[PDB]
Amino acid sequence: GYCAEKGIRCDDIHCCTGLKCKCNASGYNCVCRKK
16 A cells, blocks of 8 residues: 655655644645654
8 A cells, every 4th residue: 555654745645544644734844744
């Protein structure tokens, strides 16, 4: 399963089970986090 690991570009791909796509409102800093 090719998914966005801890802190990976999730713009088009989703974060792996356990991480969340944390992105700013401006449209940047879109990275996965263990939230």
